[PDB]
Amino acid sequence: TGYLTIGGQRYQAEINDLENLGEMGSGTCGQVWKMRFRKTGHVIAVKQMRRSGNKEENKRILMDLDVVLKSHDCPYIVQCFGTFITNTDVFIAMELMGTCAEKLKKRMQGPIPERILGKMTVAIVKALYYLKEKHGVIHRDVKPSNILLDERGQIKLCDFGISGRLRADVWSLGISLVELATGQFPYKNCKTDFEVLTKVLQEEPPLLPGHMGFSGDFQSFVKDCLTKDHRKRPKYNKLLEHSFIKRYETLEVDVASWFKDVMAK
């Protein structure tokens, strides 16, 4: 707070040291800017919390930050370099990611390959397990717009603005994987949230289709995530033993190149 820690080293800085390269996200958990140090050109993400802002949004920004600051030892969660508090704003400095999984989907204009989703699942399951085990934290909003990738191949979870302390996170992962694997949100034509809830309860889980070349491992994993009965739905420690996860923990996947190629389309 008032200076930044990067590489485990402290650098004095202030908001005036940064130039604004424009907005990357806003709306649910604050305005996020891409920003650049005026003297070096190095780039970071900066979330801005306005003192005069919507009070509910400010409560979300602050919960998210609380979790990010707690999670400095988790490599699957975006890291915070520090904060600047002015009379009118709070600026939260964070490591810049390349884009979210939702944008990759839209750019791809179709299915994201299993191998990429394998890496993604590993990272995201580990992020959720860390949050749960270390912090008693549940995310409550896992979805492609909250999954961040970069040109180095890294994958992280973000936006814990409505995370609760003390089930359905696993379900939201399963759904996100089906969405990304097919390029179709399985609750596409639902006009209303309540409609989506009725489908979740009344219909069979939206499993991965059988004739797209998905491995049995990937199909099994998704089917486990999408188990409607919570007594049957695996704990994270058991999902981390799943063969799908074991495969991609080890497997060499060039997510970095994949990502650069997609971002060139």
To the question of whether residue 235 is assigned a binding role by annotation, the answer is no
Task: Fill in the DSSP letter of residue 113.
Answer: P
To the question of whether residue 71 is assigned a binding role by annotation, the answer is no
How many other β-carbons are positioned within 10 Å of the β-carbon of residue 176? 25
To the question of whether residue 30 is assigned a binding role by annotation, the answer is yes
Please name which of 89, 210, 97, 68 lies closest in space to residue 156, comparing C-alpha atoms. 97
Fold category of 3-94 in CATH = Phosphorylase Kinase; domain 1 (3.30.200)
**Resolution of the entry in angstroms:** 2.0
Q: Hey, what are 1's tokens?
A: 């707070």
Q: Using an 8 Å Cβ cutoff, are 120 and 147 in contact?
A: yes
- Please identify which residue in the block is written with the tokens 């989907």: 105
Task: Fill in the DSSP letter of residue 27.
Answer: S
Q: Determined by which method?
A: X-ray
Q: Hey, what are 98's tokens?
A: 């390349």
**17 three-class SS:** helix
What distances in angstroms separate CA 172 from CA 19, 144, 177, 200, 232, one per listed residue?
A: 36, 10, 9, 11, 16
To the question of whether residue 27 is assigned a binding role by annotation, the answer is yes
CA atoms within 13 A on the CB side of 27: 3
C-alpha 127/C-alpha 239 separation (Å) is 13
To the question of whether residue 182 is assigned a binding role by annotation, the answer is no
C-alpha 133/C-alpha 207 separation (Å) is 28
Fold category of 99-264 in CATH = Transferase(Phosphotransferase); domain 1 (1.10.510)
Any bridge partners for residue 94, and if so which?
45, 80
C-alpha 157/C-alpha 235 separation (Å) is 19
Residues annotated as part of the active site: 141
To the question of whether residue 100 is assigned a binding role by annotation, the answer is no
Q: What is the DSSP string of 212-227?
A: S---HHHHHHHHHHT-
Q: What is the CA radius of gyration of the chain?
A: 19
The domain spans of the chain are 3-94, 99-264
- For the chain, the straight-line distance linking the first and the last C-alpha, in angstroms and rounded, comes to 39
Residue 107's contacts (CB-CB under 8 Å, 6 or more residues apart) are 262, 263, 265
Phi, psi of 86 (to 5 degrees): -105, 180
What distances in angstroms separate CA 247 from CA 217, 250, 261, one per listed residue?
A: 9, 6, 24
Any bridge partners for residue 4, and if so which?
11
What distances in angstroms separate CA 226 from CA 85, 146, 204, 216, one per listed residue?
A: 43, 19, 9, 15
To the question of whether residue 34 is assigned a binding role by annotation, the answer is no
CA 177 from chain centre, in angstroms, equals 13
